Symmetry: D2
Subunit: 115 residues, 4 copies
């Protein structure tokens, strides 16, 4: 709801299905603590990672496990994963879509922030 | 010198070699007239398309023959070609690099304008 | 329904709203004939361009009017527009999403093809 | 020589100049140890990060300080930084270029691996 992840495959022209996504939040002791995780659906989307109540101000890292995605397709990719690090909700609650477009040696990521 | 084209391959993580590139300039009657062409080098670059004397202000189209590139690699592509259409202006910087990053179902293009 | 266009703004992190989109289909006389047009919604999406009945096999060009989008925002962009040229429905009907991500000197486009 | 970083600006259509770049190598205990760093040149490039002798197989992280880059331009950014994580392998080609294309709410990264 407040945080959604969408992943596309630039080789097949398709949603990237069953991609593992791990979200971390930076803690007071400046360490990365686990916040939420899931896998993308048949539409390439991952909903329900968190709630408005739990998604407080902070620095978040969305790690998209691109290497295991490509390896499951029989491809040896370049990157270990795609990491998206950003401050969230510093100006009040927002809704964030973190999108990634994947190729074996390249990826792009963008944020769509609304409300 | 005033206009360079660089093409990269996001699947192989390499320069895109031997890619045909056609440049057109818009004529008075809204027709695309051929201006310059070539094939990318082993570095993925196409130099020597034009000269300062010939590269006047105008609307230019750079067509990158991506479909034939992917077919030569045995890879099934989406686009017929990649087309980059832009106005060249003399008050902005006067070296133009048109770069493209290719995947089978996606491409990105950027302009690097210097000096 | 069979053809959707989605446009995002990489500067604001938002849908690109009210972007003009023109679709052409290559005719027998190898000319570009108008096929459909519209403008993106508040979600950055353009639905209803065509129907299954009208969206026959062919070579299509989706022209996204990026220059007028940026100029309306007070920015002088590099490109005249973004052009996406592809063969559609050659293996039977498909559903096509043509997506574009816009910056003043760069754009990316990808195709999501389903069914 | 074996590792180069290049950073481009998609808003201005220019090299991204004076961008801080930090490279880390994964240690035995899963900690990121500092490996090399620098700032991009006027061409947007960072050369001389390492030598062939020092750049052994391993997992590397390239952190590009995009937030400070956008702040210096008076532009409001989304990401804290851009992070590129990859394994270097000796049997693949042995020159690595890590390239990044930056917008305020989006970035793309690709690897160009040659020789
Ligand atoms: C080796 C990578 C690279 O080499 C260059 C040489 C001259 C000018 C630009 C570049 C360049 C980048 O443009 C680049 C990075 C990404 Br990510 C792209 O999606 C596109 Br398109 C271009
Ligand atoms: C909200 C982001 C989003 O919305 C979609 C709706 C339908 C199909 C694809 C997408 C999509 C993408 O992941 C996307 C991501 C990047 Br990065 C791009 O450069 C481009 Br272009 C598209």
């Amino acid at each position: 709801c407040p945080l959604m992840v969408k992943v596309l495959d630039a080789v097949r022209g398709s949603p990237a299905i069953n991609v593992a996504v791990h979200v971390f939040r930076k803690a007071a002791d400046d360490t990365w603590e686990p916040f939420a995780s899931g896998k993308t659906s048949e539409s390439g989307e991952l909903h329900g990672l968190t709630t408005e109540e739990e998604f407080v101000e902070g620095i978040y890292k969305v790690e998209i496990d691109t290497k295991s995605y490509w390896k499951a397709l029989g491809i040896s990719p370049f990157h270990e994963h795609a990491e998206v690090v950003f401050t969230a909700n510093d100006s009040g609650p927002r809704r964030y879509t973190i999108a990634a477009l994947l190729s074996p040696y390249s990826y792009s990521t963008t944020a769509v922030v609304t409300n």
